[PDB]
Design an enzyme around this catalytic site. Sequence first.
Site, PDB file in Angstrom:
ATOM      1  N   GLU B  54       0.796  -1.195   0.000  1.00  0.00           N
ATOM      2  CA  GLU B  54       0.000   0.000   0.000  1.00  0.00           C
ATOM      3  C   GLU B  54       0.868   1.304   0.000  1.00  0.00           C
ATOM      4  O   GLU B  54       1.917   1.337   0.543  1.00  0.00           O
ATOM      5  CB  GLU B  54      -1.006   0.113   1.114  1.00  0.00           C
ATOM      6  CG  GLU B  54      -0.250   0.139   2.406  1.00  0.00           C
ATOM      7  CD  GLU B  54      -1.237   0.735   3.427  1.00  0.00           C
ATOM      8  OE1 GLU B  54      -1.938   1.716   3.109  1.00  0.00           O
ATOM      9  OE2 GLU B  54      -1.304   0.183   4.530  1.00  0.00           O
ATOM     10  N   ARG B  65      -2.873  11.226   6.654  1.00  0.00           N
ATOM     11  CA  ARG B  65      -2.713  10.481   5.427  1.00  0.00           C
ATOM     12  C   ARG B  65      -4.019  10.421   4.670  1.00  0.00           C
ATOM     13  O   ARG B  65      -4.054  10.022   3.497  1.00  0.00           O
ATOM     14  CB  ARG B  65      -2.222   9.048   5.676  1.00  0.00           C
ATOM     15  CG  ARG B  65      -0.756   8.798   5.702  1.00  0.00           C
ATOM     16  CD  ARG B  65      -0.549   7.317   6.008  1.00  0.00           C
ATOM     17  NE  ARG B  65      -0.356   6.627   4.750  1.00  0.00           N
ATOM     18  CZ  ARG B  65      -0.570   5.324   4.607  1.00  0.00           C
ATOM     19  NH1 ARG B  65      -1.001   4.695   5.690  1.00  0.00           N
ATOM     20  NH2 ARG B  65      -0.328   4.684   3.487  1.00  0.00           N
ATOM     21  N   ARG B  69      -5.688   5.617  -1.329  1.00  0.00           N
ATOM     22  CA  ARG B  69      -4.524   4.776  -1.423  1.00  0.00           C
ATOM     23  C   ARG B  69      -4.486   4.084  -2.765  1.00  0.00           C
ATOM     24  O   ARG B  69      -5.473   3.937  -3.450  1.00  0.00           O
ATOM     25  CB  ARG B  69      -4.602   3.628  -0.403  1.00  0.00           C
ATOM     26  CG  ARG B  69      -4.880   4.035   1.049  1.00  0.00           C
ATOM     27  CD  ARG B  69      -3.565   4.426   1.707  1.00  0.00           C
ATOM     28  NE  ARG B  69      -3.873   4.744   3.090  1.00  0.00           N
ATOM     29  CZ  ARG B  69      -4.271   5.921   3.593  1.00  0.00           C
ATOM     30  NH1 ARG B  69      -4.423   6.946   2.834  1.00  0.00           N
ATOM     31  NH2 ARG B  69      -4.488   6.021   4.907  1.00  0.00           N
ATOM     32  N   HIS B  85     -10.776   4.461   2.121  1.00  0.00           N
ATOM     33  CA  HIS B  85     -10.063   3.750   3.145  1.00  0.00           C
ATOM     34  C   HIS B  85     -10.309   2.257   3.149  1.00  0.00           C
ATOM     35  O   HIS B  85     -10.592   1.626   4.169  1.00  0.00           O
ATOM     36  CB  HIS B  85     -10.325   4.351   4.549  1.00  0.00           C
ATOM     37  CG  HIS B  85      -9.283   4.058   5.576  1.00  0.00           C
ATOM     38  ND1 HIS B  85      -9.491   3.141   6.601  1.00  0.00           N
ATOM     39  CD2 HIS B  85      -8.039   4.549   5.765  1.00  0.00           C
ATOM     40  CE1 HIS B  85      -8.412   3.098   7.359  1.00  0.00           C
ATOM     41  NE2 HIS B  85      -7.511   3.943   6.887  1.00  0.00           N
TER      42      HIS B  85
END
Lengths: 96, 96
Positions: B54, B65, B69, B85
Amino acid sequence: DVSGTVCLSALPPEATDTLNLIASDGPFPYSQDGVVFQNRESVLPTQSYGYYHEYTVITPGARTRGTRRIITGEATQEDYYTGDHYATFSLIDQTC
Amino acid sequence: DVSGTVCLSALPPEATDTLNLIASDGPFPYSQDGVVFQNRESVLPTQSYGYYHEYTVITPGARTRGTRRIITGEATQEDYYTGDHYATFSLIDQTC
């Protein structure tokens, strides 16, 4: 003995995923998917070796393949669910 | 499961940045970048431990953050975007 019948809609969702893979003959996620189930403890009706095959029902969150499986027999719609690593089995009714 | 395929040009521009960093092996902005993604919930295809990694997709203005991703798989061009997420994923098509 088979512990009763269970509706497909009542099982974890992943049980539906496995049945769809069995329908198409995979490809399967685990190399152990599709091996013969020996029915050593004679929980399921006695049959010749090779009659039964086992497939993983994925358990989200588990670190292993877990304890949920679908065992198929040769008859039409002869699909059994176990959630307890072969202790108990239910015949799956795919119409409910 | 994976939601579908999305063109890279249709994702936030920061996704393009992260893919560029992955191609050059960094350096990455966050220390968590490059750690193994366990796929504990089985949302992505089942693979061996370490198959997935990741990387952060920066959210403009965030102090943390955030929730975006990119998850790489070991296969050629196998890269997944999540903007929620790890709830849902889409495969990235770098050709469009």
